[PDB]
Amino acid sequence: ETVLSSQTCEQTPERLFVPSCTTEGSYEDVQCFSGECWCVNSWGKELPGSRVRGGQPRCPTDCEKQRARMQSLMG
């Protein structure tokens, strides 16, 4: 069970990155640190390529997720 659980343990975070999250406690759609920002899903994994230099990335909608999934399956 633990070696299944470690398949998604690819996390070497910085010591001081605070994860901002909602009043009920679900993860905020944008996470920012050190002038960088990115989109995360409901779990704490950033979406690949969503990291932007400036700030406030637009988190992808249903169409972009469907396009990425169909392209990857077409691969």
Give 35 or 75: the residue with its C-beta nearer to a second copy. Answer: 35
Distance set, CA 72 to CA 3, 19, 41, 45, 50 (Å): 26, 29, 18, 18, 17
DSSP one-letter string for 60-75: --HHHHHHHHHHHHH-
Judged by CB under 8 A, the number of residues near a second copy is 5
CB of 14 to a second copy, least distance (A): 9
Q: Which of residues 17-56 bind a second copy (CB under 8 A)?
A: 34-36, 53-54
Residues in contact with a second copy by CB under 8 A are 34-36, 53-54
